[PDB]
Amino acid sequence: AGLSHYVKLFSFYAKMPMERKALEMVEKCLDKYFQHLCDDLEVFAAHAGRKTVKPEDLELLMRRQGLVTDQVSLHVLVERHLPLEYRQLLIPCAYSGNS
Amino acid sequence: MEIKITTVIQHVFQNLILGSKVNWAEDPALKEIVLQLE
Amino acid sequence: EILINRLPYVKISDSFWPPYVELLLRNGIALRHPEDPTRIRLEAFH
Amino acid sequence: GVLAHLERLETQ
Amino acid sequence: EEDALQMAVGYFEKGPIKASQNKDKTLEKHLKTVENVAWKNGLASEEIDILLNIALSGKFGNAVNTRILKCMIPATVISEDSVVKAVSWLCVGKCSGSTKVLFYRWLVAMFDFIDRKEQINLLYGFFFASLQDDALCPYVCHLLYLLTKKENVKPFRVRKLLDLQAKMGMQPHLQALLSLYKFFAPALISVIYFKNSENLWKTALLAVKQRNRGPSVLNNSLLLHYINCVRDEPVLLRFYYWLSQTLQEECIWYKVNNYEHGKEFTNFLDTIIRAECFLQEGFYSCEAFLYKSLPLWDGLCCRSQFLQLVSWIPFSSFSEVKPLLFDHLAQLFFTSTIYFKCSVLQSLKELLQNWLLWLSMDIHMKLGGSMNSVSKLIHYVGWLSTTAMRLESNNTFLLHFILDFYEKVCDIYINYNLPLVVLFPPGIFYSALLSLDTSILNQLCFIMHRYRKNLTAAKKNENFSSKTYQEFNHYLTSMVGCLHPSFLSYAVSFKWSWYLDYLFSQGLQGLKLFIRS
Amino acid sequence: KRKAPRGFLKRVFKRKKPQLRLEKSGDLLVHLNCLLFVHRLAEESRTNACASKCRVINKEHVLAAAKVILKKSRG
């Protein structure tokens, strides 16, 4: 499903043919990626003292992953990869009604 | 050097009365300013 | 628009009210610098 | 034509 | 009642579905049975596409349940597109992305019916900036593939399409849009194809078609007229160099296949032949390829095409074209069968007309040395056609084509205003006079009657007179005394005037034109 | 590929850890995290392929990629 979505997106992200036997191991890589993430969101949201995981709860985590910097903030990272109708939810546009 | 500004401000009317809360064509002022003739 | 008229890629050096700067970015009005994304260019409609 | 035809009585 | 019913649906929108005393799907379904007959008047389509889709009740099922059939009976008008671009406003209501997908599919499917497509084209960027969102790209790409004009190919849009191609996939819809943008101003270069998905809507859209029913230059015929009219230097040379390098490369292509390449070359030489029959002057690569490839030529290799190329050969001198070409259309004429022989005196028959046309207006556009060229061509054919008469023991088939050539030699003065009455060489005249069938005998009779007519016409306006009239009176007294074997065949199948009537009546029309003369 | 599954990421975030309150579009942030993680995977696996000059990504390059990037992507 979604792991199959990412391995297919791996094909258009690696720009280069790979093997299916590589894909079920990258599936375990995504499973462990969540096995680190969802308890990294767990511990980071607990660090903020909030039960829920707000967007800034993940901005700090992505700062940990070195992908958010003072040059590359959270929102700019949304520009480069997410589609428009999806970043319309994340980065606040303006209508005098900023999302 | 002026039409090149008139093809810039024009295309930021095709992109400002699009991305905002436009209510673009249900208005008689913009309807002649939007659909801006090339 | 003044900066693009004579060329610039900075043109705001990250102008403020971040809802606004990203406004003219999603609609295609302006473009982020592909390498240093704290500076903006107006999409070069020329 | 009678040239395209004359090429098919050469055969036939 | 639909206008009343649709305003009731609007009331169904000014209030909630729960507060309504009746179901929407009942009244909108009565409207749907109406759509199965006639879905939406231009004003009706406009309004019901406007209010049902901007923000109001318009359920992503209900607005879609209508949008599947919310197209137009007569035509879609500008005001339909106007404030549904304010449904494309794509905001707090937005007519959320699924109904957007059916909406852009609506426009793609009914792009053909708008009174002023230029108005929507003037709205190009409003849909082009809708290409960035992922869900509408496969349909917005189709729409802009249908909406694109040169005024909408500004370089920033080219760079936006390139950014979309880099960020997103190589999707064939983006490739199709890129193909259009390359077909226009090439600020981008790239090398599926209007394969639509509105086929499901094309149940209703095929009903809509039925409803509207009831309620470098050779393969361009529209551009061939330009080159027909410009005898300009850099275009007849831009075209000469293409023909020479297409008749060389693709004819060297024979030397590797000679069987399967012998069908596109034949079908390309057919296009050359048609282009010359239209444009009416021999392409200067058509002869230049002929002199180059006639000595190497066989009898039957593209005979039907090569011997129609010979017809369109720029009249040269018949002293500079004879050794180069006609010395080979005799080198193969005298060594090949009748079926190539008849294909040359026919080829040179058409060559005679294509030289005499260009000589008629050489009288129109204001001779003697040009005269000597057609006269010598006809004599050389008249030399060709006495020895071809000898090779095949007076074969009637070959002499039929010989006379078919001479059927266009009797009428030089009457037809082309050219004073070039060239009589038979006797090796054909009496060889058909004392022939054995009448479809060749009446042929000769028609030719000589047109010869009488043409000589009489030349006597009116004015060497021809002395020796030509002597030879024609020779062909007359000898033959008019002779006017017999095929006539004997008729007489066996058969009171002199009644014999005539039996003749005459039975197709002998060249004999009619003589006997009346 | 131009998609991002709303349902799948939420189902994974609920299956793996039963006690969270991921926000309205927080799963979209999780998708961005995985998108960039697989970006790093693709690029550093291309580097791994050029390391052994293999013209096809294989198991022995992905396993080396994992212990670098997956550990790096840990918060």
mmCIF file of C-alpha atoms in Angstrom, chain A residues 6-73:
data_model
loop_
_atom_site.group_PDB
_atom_site.id
_atom_site.type_symbol
_atom_site.label_atom_id
_atom_site.label_comp_id
_atom_site.label_asym_id
_atom_site.label_seq_id
_atom_site.Cartn_x
_atom_site.Cartn_y
_atom_site.Cartn_z
ATOM 1 C CA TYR A 6 7.060 4.869 -1.454
ATOM 2 C CA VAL A 7 8.970 2.111 -3.245
ATOM 3 C CA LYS A 8 7.311 3.226 -6.491
ATOM 4 C CA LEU A 9 8.199 6.808 -5.575
ATOM 5 C CA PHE A 10 11.695 5.496 -4.835
ATOM 6 C CA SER A 11 11.792 4.547 -8.532
ATOM 7 C CA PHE A 12 11.107 8.164 -9.521
ATOM 8 C CA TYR A 13 13.340 9.371 -6.687
ATOM 9 C CA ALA A 14 16.361 7.132 -7.361
ATOM 10 C CA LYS A 15 16.011 7.810 -11.119
ATOM 11 C CA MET A 16 17.477 4.351 -11.629
ATOM 12 C CA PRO A 17 16.172 0.761 -11.835
ATOM 13 C CA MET A 18 16.489 -1.397 -8.719
ATOM 14 C CA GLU A 19 15.404 -4.851 -7.559
ATOM 15 C CA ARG A 20 12.217 -5.986 -5.840
ATOM 16 C CA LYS A 21 14.328 -7.794 -3.242
ATOM 17 C CA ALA A 22 15.699 -4.328 -2.530
ATOM 18 C CA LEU A 23 12.127 -3.067 -2.083
ATOM 19 C CA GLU A 24 10.960 -5.416 0.654
ATOM 20 C CA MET A 25 14.093 -4.495 2.623
ATOM 21 C CA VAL A 26 13.425 -0.798 2.102
ATOM 22 C CA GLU A 27 9.990 -1.769 3.412
ATOM 23 C CA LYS A 28 11.659 -2.898 6.645
ATOM 24 C CA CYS A 29 13.608 0.364 6.485
ATOM 25 C CA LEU A 30 10.332 2.314 6.389
ATOM 26 C CA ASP A 31 8.888 0.114 9.142
ATOM 27 C CA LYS A 32 11.900 0.895 11.340
ATOM 28 C CA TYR A 33 11.720 4.506 10.144
ATOM 29 C CA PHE A 34 8.286 4.662 11.741
ATOM 30 C CA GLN A 35 9.579 2.530 14.643
ATOM 31 C CA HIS A 36 11.951 5.453 15.281
ATOM 32 C CA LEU A 37 9.641 8.265 14.166
ATOM 33 C CA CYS A 38 6.313 7.615 15.860
ATOM 34 C CA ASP A 39 8.138 7.250 19.164
ATOM 35 C CA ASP A 40 10.311 10.219 18.216
ATOM 36 C CA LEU A 41 7.159 12.232 17.676
ATOM 37 C CA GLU A 42 6.032 10.552 20.914
ATOM 38 C CA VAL A 43 9.026 11.775 22.907
ATOM 39 C CA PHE A 44 9.186 15.191 21.200
ATOM 40 C CA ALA A 45 5.498 15.901 21.829
ATOM 41 C CA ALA A 46 6.012 14.735 25.409
ATOM 42 C CA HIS A 47 8.982 17.120 25.584
ATOM 43 C CA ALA A 48 6.676 20.011 24.667
ATOM 44 C CA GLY A 49 4.273 18.748 27.339
ATOM 45 C CA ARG A 50 1.418 18.380 24.844
ATOM 46 C CA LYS A 51 -0.577 15.206 24.257
ATOM 47 C CA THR A 52 -1.079 16.006 20.567
ATOM 48 C CA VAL A 53 1.613 16.383 17.908
ATOM 49 C CA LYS A 54 1.426 19.952 16.629
ATOM 50 C CA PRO A 55 3.258 20.984 13.433
ATOM 51 C CA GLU A 56 6.045 22.595 15.478
ATOM 52 C CA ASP A 57 6.420 19.270 17.298
ATOM 53 C CA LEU A 58 7.651 17.861 13.978
ATOM 54 C CA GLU A 59 9.584 20.960 12.917
ATOM 55 C CA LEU A 60 11.956 20.319 15.821
ATOM 56 C CA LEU A 61 12.248 16.664 14.812
ATOM 57 C CA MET A 62 13.130 17.630 11.251
ATOM 58 C CA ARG A 63 15.648 20.068 12.711
ATOM 59 C CA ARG A 64 17.096 16.965 14.365
ATOM 60 C CA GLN A 65 17.191 15.229 10.977
ATOM 61 C CA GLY A 66 19.184 18.206 9.688
ATOM 62 C CA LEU A 67 16.614 19.035 7.012
ATOM 63 C CA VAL A 68 15.307 22.190 8.693
ATOM 64 C CA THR A 69 18.037 24.816 9.026
ATOM 65 C CA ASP A 70 18.222 28.571 9.419
ATOM 66 C CA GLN A 71 18.503 28.594 5.614
ATOM 67 C CA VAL A 72 15.879 25.887 4.987
ATOM 68 C CA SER A 73 12.963 26.366 7.389
#
